Design a protein around this ligand. Structure first.
Ligand SMILES: [Mg+2]
Ligand SMILES: [Mg+2]
Ligand SMILES: [Mg+2]
Ligand SMILES: [Zn+2]
Ligand SMILES: [Zn+2]
Ligand SMILES: [Zn+2]
Lengths: 279, 94, 185, 261, 224
RNA sequence: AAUUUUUAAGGUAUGUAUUUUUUUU
RNA sequence: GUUCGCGAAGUAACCCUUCGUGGACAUUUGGUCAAUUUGAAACAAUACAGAGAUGAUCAGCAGUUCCCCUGCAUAAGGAUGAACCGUUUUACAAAGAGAUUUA
RNA sequence: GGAGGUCAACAUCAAGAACUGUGGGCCUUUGCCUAUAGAACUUAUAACGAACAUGGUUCUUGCCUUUUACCAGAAC
C-alpha cells in the first residue's frame, strides 16, 4: 500500500528520475538540471512519512524471515530488539524531525538498564530479546506524530489536487519590517497633505510631495537643516512632524539594539553593522 | 429614540442564529474531523407536476471532497443597484 | 449562501412521466460546460430503473441567462435549440437576437455573473445517368424516394448521378426532374 | 434485419487478444500516474489501428437491446469490443428508429453518451460542440492508404464512398485533388459521430491488393470535424437549406400552439 | 436499523490488493485518487499495525482488519488487551528462556539488516509464507507439576477467552482469578517484578522530593 | 557530582520555438 | 425454501410418504466514472535571447498585476522569483490688436 | 426470556468536598430557610489512564550567517 501511495505521488508530481526502492530509499537516478533540482526538492511530509514506513517495513521483514524458516525464535526477538534500539542508525528519521533524538536516546538508556540486569553473570554476547520497553517508547512517539503527519500530508495533497491559495497575506517579520514602516509612513503623509489642500489636482503633485519628504529625512540624518524656497508653511509643518516621529523611532531602536548588543544577547550580524552606522 | 429593549433582543437573536450557520458550515468544510466537533424535499418541480425528493449521497472518505473545488481567480462584474447621488490666490499659495 | 439557494431548473419533458422522483444533490460537482465554474450537481433517473442517469450540465445562472434547461439545453418554454430559437426571432422583427458568447476563459467566467441576460431568452452494373438535379437535395432523399416508389453514386459538382441496380430486372420494374437513360456494358 | 436483427453480435476480439496498455517505449521511464513514457522525445505516437469492423457481420442483438439502452458501443465501432452478446450497449449501425429515441439528447452529448464541449477544439478533435450541429466530416492523412497511390480521385472517391457508405446515410461526398481532404456529410448528426470513431487510424484499398499485408504499419488517416464550407456556392445552399428547414420548424411550433389554444 | 458489519472472506481482500498491483488502465483513475487521499491516514495504520505485534510466545496472531474496497489501505482494527499479572508472567517467563538460551549455545548469530535487498519486491503472503508450517516460539519448559494451574492456558494468544468465571467473555475485559493461580503468577514473575516493598525505602526518592529538587535547584545524590 | 552526534534553502539562471498530413471558393 | 392450516392419494391404532392448494416469513443493488491514437501531465535534448540599480562590481527588503513554483506554513527560498520603467494635448476661457464682413 | 458481542447510537465523567428530586415556609419562580427520597462511574502521598506522546502562543534561555529542523525551563 505505502509503496504505491508514494510512487503515485512522486510520479504525479512528474518526477520519474527519483526512484523509490522497496526498502523506501529515495534515490536519484540521474544528474539533474536546476529546474529538475528545484522541483525535486521534497518536503518533510514526504520524507518523514517515508522514513516511518521504513521502520515498519524493517520489523515486518524480521517476522517474515521468522515465518519463512530462515531464522529462529530467539533470533527473531533479538532482531526486533536490535531494530527498536537502533532506529537512529538504520533509518534516519532524525534528519526530518530532530526532536526524535529524545526517543532514540531513551531507547539507548533502556538498553543499558535492560542489559546490565540481563547480562549479569554471563557474557558480553548479542543474546537479548526483551523488547517491551523500546517498543512502548516508539509506540508513544507514534501517538503524537499522527496529528503532525495528518496536517502536513493533508496540506500537501489538498494543495496537490486543488492548487495553492491565491491570496496569501504575508505577515510582518524581522526581514520585512522597515519596508512596511516606509509604506505606512508614505500613506500617512499623503492622507494629511491631501486633506489640507483645496481640491482639484493631486497625483503628480502627490508624487512630488513624497520626494520632498524623503529628501527631508535624508537631510535630518545628515544634520543639514532642510530649508526650502517657497513652500506652503502647513506642508512644511506636516513633513517636520512626521520626520520627528520617524527620527524618534530611529533613535529609540538605535539605543535598544545597542543595550541588547552590550549585555551579550544575540543581535545577529547586520544589525550590528547597521547599528554602528546609527550610533 | 433609542432602539428599545424588545427590538435589540430580536436582532441579537436573528443575527446570532445566522452567524452560527456560517461558523458551523465553515468548520465542517475543512479537512478536520477534529475541528468539526464544534458545529427537506425542498423542490416542487416547475409547475409542481412531478414533485421531487432530494438526497445527498455519501462521498467516499478517501476521495477528494468537493471534487469540483479548485482554487481559481474570478473577476467580478459590478452590482445591479445604481446611481447613488453624491450630494455634496491660493493656487499660487498651494 | 448564493451558491446553494437558487432551486434547479429542469424541464418537465426530460424529467420523465413518473409521479414522484428522488434525485441526488452534490454540493460541488463539475463546472459548467459554459462558465467553467463549480456548482451543485443533480443526478436523477426518469424511472426507478432505466439504464441512464441524467446529469445537470450547466449552472442555474448560466441556464437562467439563456432561458433554457439544465439537462436538455432546450428552451425552457418551447424546447427549441438556441442555435434555432434565435433565428425565429431574427426572422420576425429584422436584425436582432444574435448571442455573442463566451470566448477566452476569464471572459465567460466573468460573463456568467451579470444579470444583463441574453438574446432570444430575453424575449421569452446497370448505370442510369442522372441530370437535372438540384444541387441541394441529398442522395438520402433520392434513394428513399425510389424505395417508396418500389447502389448509387452522385457527383455534386457535376450535378450528375449514376445508378446501378442489382438487376436490370429492377430496371424494368422502376421503368414501371430527371434524365434517366439506361446504358452500361 | 436479415443482417442485424436475429443475430447476437459475435465477439470482435478475445479478452486475451486486446492490445495491452502502456504503449511501447516512447520514453525512458513509465509514469504510473499519467500512463505515458516520461523522459525523452516522442516521435509521432500515432499508428494505424490494428482493428476495424465488418458492418454487416459483427452487428447483432445484445443485452443492451433487452435493456433498450439508447447508447451505442464504441468498442464495437472500433471493432474491438470483447463483450459481444454480454455487452451492455447496442451493436449496430444507427437507424432512424433508434435515432428518434436519442433525438432528444443528441444535442448535449453524442451517440455514445459523451458530453459535448462548448468551444470544440483547436484541431477539431474527438467530439464537437453542442453549440453547432455539424453533419460534415473531414478526412485527412490519406497516407493511411499508404504509399500506394491511385490513378485519379475516382479510385479514392469510390473507395471512400464505399467504406463510409455502410456506416450510415450520406448526403454528399467530395474528395479534393489539390488538397487531400474529402468532406463527408451524413444525413444525420448521430451517424457522423459513429463514423468518426470507426474510421480513425485506418487503412485502405481492398482486402488483398498490393501492400495490404504490410498495411498495418503506416501513419494512419485522420477523421475530424469540418469547418463551414467557405465557398458562396454551398454557403448560399447551407443558408438556403437553413431557412427552408426553419420554415418547417415554424409550423410545428405554431401547431403545438394551435394545439395549445 | 443498524445491522452490524459483515465479515468477509480474506480471499476477497487478497484479490483486490494484488489486482491493484499493476494498474496502467483508465479504469483506475478514481482508485489512484483514493491512494493519494489515503496517504493522510497512513501513519495511523502504522500505529494500529505495530501495537498489535505478536510477542514472542505467539507463533501467529490473526487480527481483524478494516480495508478500503479499492484496496487503498488496510487498518488493523483490534486493540490488544492483557491481564496485567498474566502478561508480566509471560514476559518474565520468556526472560528466563532468553538467559538460559544465551548461556546455552555458544555461537549466537544475529539477523542481517535489512533482511531483504532493495530491488526485490515484497513477497506475497499467499504464495511464499502461507504454505510453510511455522517454526516453534520461545515458550519455556515451565515445570511438570508446580505450574499445573497456569501451564495449560499461559501461552495462549488471549490467555482465557472462554471461561465464564475467569474472565468477562470474548470481549476480554474484567479478569477474575482464584488464589493458587495468583500464587503461580507471582512465583513466575520474580525476575521482573521483584522490587522493594516498604514505603520507607523510597524516602527521598518519591516524586515530591524530585519536584522539590527541581523547584529548589538541588540534587539528591542519584536524582535527576 | 558528566557533554552528545543532523538534514533541506539562500549558486550556478530564466525565457521563447522546435516531432504536426496539405478544411471545400 | 421453512412453518401453520386445509383438501386427496398408498401405508396406515391416524402415522409415515406423495400430490393439489389458502396464509405467513423475505421485497428494488450499482454508475458524476465505457478498454490505447482525437478533450489536453511534464522533463530532457537542440537552436536562439542572456541573470536589477551603476562609471563599474555587488547585499538585499518591499510595493503593484485578471503571474505563479518548492514548502506543513501566516517561515523561508525560487535572477532582489517573474512581469512591470512604456504613451501622454479640450471642466478651458477673459482682455486687447490687425484684417475680412453684413442689416 | 437468559448468557454474551474487540457491535452501534445517545447522555455523562476535575466541583463551596464538590449531586439531583420532592414537600413545606419567606420572598412573589430566580433566591433564602426547613423536612425528606434517591446518589452508577472518577478522586487524598488527590483522579477518567497504577500509562504518557506532539503542536500553538507568549516569556526566560542554549547553539549563533538567516528560515526550517532544533537546546530546556515556565505560564496559558
Ligand atoms: Mg534572503
Ligand atoms: Mg521580487
Ligand atoms: Mg523572495
Ligand atoms: Zn455556469
Ligand atoms: Zn430538460
Ligand atoms: Zn460492445
Amino acid at each position: 500500500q505505502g509503496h504505491n501511495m508514494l510512487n503515485l505521488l512522486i510520479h504525479r508530481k512528474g518526477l520519474t528520475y527519483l526512484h523509490l526502492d522497496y526498502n523506501f530509499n529515495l534515490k536519484p537516478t540521474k544528474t539533474l538540471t536546476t529546474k529538475e533540482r528545484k522541483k525535486s526538492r521534497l518536503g518533510n511530509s514526504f520524507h518523514l512519512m517515508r522514513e516511518l514506513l521504513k521502520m515498519m517495513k524493517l520489523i515486518v521483514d524480521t517476522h517474515v524471515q521468522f515465518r519463512l524458516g530462515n531464522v529462529d525464535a530467539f533470533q527473531l526477538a533479538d532482531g526486533i530488539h536490535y531494530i527498536l534500539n537502533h532506529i537512529g542508525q538504520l533509518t534516519g528519521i532524525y534528519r526530518y524531525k530532530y526532536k526524535v533524538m529524545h526517543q532514540i536516546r531513551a531507547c539507548k538508556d533502556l538498553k543499558h538498564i535492560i542489559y546490565y540486569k540481563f547480562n549479569k553473570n554471563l557474557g558480553k554476547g548479542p543474546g537479548c530479546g526483551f523488547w517491551q520497553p523500546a517498543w512502548r517508547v516508539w509506540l508513544n512517539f507514534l501517538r503524537g506524530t499522527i496529528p503532525l503527519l495528518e496536517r502536513y500530508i493533508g496540506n500537501l495533497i489538498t494543495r496537490q489536487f486543488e492548487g495553492r491559495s491565491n491570496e496569501i497575506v504575508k505577515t510582518t517579520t524581522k526581514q520585512r519590517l522597515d519596508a512596511y514602516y516606509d509604506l505606512e509612513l508614505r500613506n500617512s503623509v499623503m492622507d494629511d497633505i491631501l486633506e489640507m489642500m483645496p481640491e482639484s489636482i493631486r497625483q503628480k503633485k502627490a508624487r512630488t510631495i513624497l520626494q520632498h519628504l524623503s529628501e527631508a529625512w535624508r537631510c535630518w540624518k545628515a544634520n543639514i537643516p532642510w530649508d526650502v524656497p517657497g513652500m506652503p508653511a502647513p506642508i512644511k509643518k506636516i513633513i517636520e512632524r512626521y520626520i520627528k516621529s520617524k527620527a524618534d523611532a530611529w533613535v529609540s531602536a538605535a539605543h535598544y539594539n545597542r543595550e541588547r548588543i552590550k549585555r551579550g544577547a544575540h543581535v545577529e550580524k547586520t544589525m550590528v553593522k547597521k547599528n554602528l552606522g546609527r550610533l | 429614540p433609542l432602539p428599545t429593549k424588545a427590538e435589540i433582543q430580536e436582532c441579537t437573536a436573528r443575527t446570532k442564529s445566522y452567524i452560527q450557520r456560517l461558523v458551523n458550515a465553515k468548520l465542517a468544510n475543512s479537512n478536520n474531523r477534529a475541528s468539526s466537533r464544534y458545529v427537506a424535499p425542498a423542490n416542487l418541480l416547475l409547475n409542481n407536476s412531478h414533485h421531487i425528493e432530494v438526497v445527498s449521497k455519501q462521498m467516499d472518505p478517501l476521495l477528494p471532497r468537493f471534487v469540483g473545488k479548485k482554487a481559481r481567480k474570478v473577476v467580478a462584474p459590478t452590482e445591479n443597484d445604481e446611481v447613488v447621488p453624491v450630494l455634496h490666490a491660493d493656487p499660487n499659495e498651494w | 449562501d448564493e451558491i446553494n439557494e437558487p432551486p434547479p431548473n429542469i424541464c418537465e419533458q426530460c424529467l420523465g412521466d413518473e409521479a414522484n422522483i428522488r434525485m441526488t444533490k452534490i454540493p460541488q460537482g463539475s463546472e459548467c460546460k459554459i462558465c467553467t465554474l463549480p456548482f451543485t450537481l443533480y443526478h436523477f433517473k426518469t424511472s426507478k430503473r432505466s439504464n441512464n442517469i441524467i446529469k445537470t450540465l450547466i449552472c442555474v445562472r448560466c441556464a437562467t441567462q439563456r432561458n433554457i434547461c439544465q439537462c436538455c439545453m432546450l428552451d425552457s418554454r418551447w424546447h427549441i435549440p438556441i442555435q434555432l430559437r434565435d433565428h425565429l426571432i431574427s426572422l420576425v422583427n429584422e436584425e436582432n437576437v444574435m448571442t455573442e458568447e463566451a470566448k477566452n476563459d476569464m471572459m465567460k467566467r466573468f460573463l456568467s455573473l451579470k444579470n444583463v441576460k441574453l438574446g432570444g431568452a430575453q424575449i421569452t452494373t446497370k448505370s442510369f445517368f442522372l441530370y437535372n438535379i438540384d444541387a441541394s437535395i441529398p442522395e438520402w432523399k433520392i434513394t428513399d424516394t425510389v424505395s417508396q416508389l418500389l447502389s448509387l453514386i452522385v457527383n455534386h459538382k457535376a450535378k450528375c448521378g449514376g445508378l446501378r441496380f442489382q438487376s436490370s430486372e429492377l430496371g424494368e420494374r422502376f421503368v414501371s426532374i430527371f434524365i434517366i437513360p439506361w446504358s452500361s456494358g | 434485419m436479415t443482417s442485424w436483427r436475429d443475430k447476437s453480435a459475435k465477439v470482435q476480439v478475445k479478452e486475451s487478444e486486446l492490445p495491452s496498455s502502456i504503449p511501447a517505449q516512447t520514453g525512458l521511464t513509465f509514469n504510473i500516474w499519467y500512463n505515458k513514457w516520461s523522459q525523452g522525445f516522442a516521435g509521432n505516437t500515432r499508428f494505424v489501428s490494428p482493428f476495424a469492423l465488418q458492418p454487416q457481420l459483427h452487428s447483432g442483438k445484445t443485452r443492451g437491446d433487452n435493456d433498450g439502452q439508447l447508447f451505442f458501443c464504441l468498442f464495437f465501432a472500433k471493432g474491438m469490443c470483447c463483450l459481444g452478446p454480454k455487452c451492455e450497449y447496442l451493436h449496430h449501425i444507427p437507424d432512424e428508429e433508434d435515432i428518434g429515441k436519442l433525438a432528444l439528447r443528441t444535442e448535449v452529448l453524442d451517440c455514445f453518451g459523451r458530453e459535448k464541449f462548448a468551444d470544440y477544439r483547436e484541431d477539431m478533435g474527438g467530439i464537437g460542440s453542442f453549440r453547432k450541429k455539424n453533419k460534415t466530416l473531414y478526412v485527412g492523412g490519406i497516407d493511411g492508404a499508404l504509399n500506394s497511390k491511385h490513378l485519379k480521385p475516382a479510385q479514392i472517391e469510390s473507395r471512400i464512398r464505399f467504406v463510409f457508405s455502410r456506416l450510415g446515410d450520406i448526403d454528399r461526398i467530395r474528395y479534393v485533388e489539390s488538397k487531400n481532404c474529402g468532406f463527408v456529410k451524413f444525413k444525420y448528426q448521430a451517424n457522423a459521430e459513429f463514423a468518426k470513431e470507426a474510421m480513425s487510424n485506418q487503412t485502405l484499398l481492398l482486402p488483398s491488393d498490393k501492400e495490404w499485408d504490410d498495411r498495418r504499419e503506416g501513419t494512419g488517416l485522420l477523421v475530424k470535424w469540418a469547418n463551414e464550407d467557405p465557398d458562396p456556392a454551398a454557403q448560399k445552399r447551407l443558408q438556403e437549406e437553413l431557412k427552408l428547414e426553419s420554415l418547417n420548424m415554424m409550423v410545428h411550433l405554431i401547431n403545438n400552439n394551435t394545439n395549445s389554444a | 436499523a443498524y445491522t452490524p458489519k459483515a465479515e468477509m472472506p480474506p480471499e476477497h481482500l487478497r484479490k483486490i490488493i494484488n489486482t491493484h498491483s499493476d494498474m496502467a488502465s483508465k479504469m483506475y483513475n478514481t482508485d489512484k485518487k483514493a491512494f493519494l487521499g489515503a496517504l493522510k491516514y497512513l501513519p495511523h495504520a502504522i500505529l494500529k499495525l505495530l501495537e498489535n505485534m505478536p510477542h514472542p510466545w505467539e507463533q501467529a496472531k490473526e487480527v481483524k482488519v478494516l480495508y478500503h474496497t479499492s484496496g487503498a489501505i488496510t487498518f488493523v482494527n483490534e486493540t490488544p488487551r492483557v491481564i496485567e499479572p498474566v502478561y508480566t508472567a509471560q514476559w518474565s517467563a520468556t526472560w528466563i528462556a532468553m538467559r538460559r538460551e544465551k548461556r546455552d549455545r555458544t555461537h549466537f548469530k544475529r539477523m542481517r539488516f535489512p533482511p531483504f535487498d532493495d530491488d526485490e519486491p515484497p513477497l506475497s503472503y499467499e504464495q511464499h509464507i502461507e504454505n510453510i508450517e511455522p517454526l516453534d516460539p520461545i515458550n519455556l519448559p515451565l515445570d511438570s507439576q508446580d505450574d499445573e494451574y497456569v501451564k495449560d492456558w499461559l501461552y495462549d494468544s488471549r490467555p482465557l477467552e472462554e471461561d465464564s468465571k475467569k474472565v468477562n467473555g470474548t470481549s476480554y475485559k474484567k479478569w477474575s482469578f482464584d488464589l493458587p493461580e495468583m500464587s503461580n503468577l507471582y512465583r513466575l514473575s520474580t525476575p521482573l517484578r521483584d522490587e522493594v516493598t516498604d514505603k520507607n525505602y523510597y524516602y527521598l526518592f518519591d516524586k515530591k522530593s524530585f519536584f522539590n529538587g527541581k523547584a529548589l535547584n538541588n540534587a539528591i545524590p542519584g536524582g535527576p
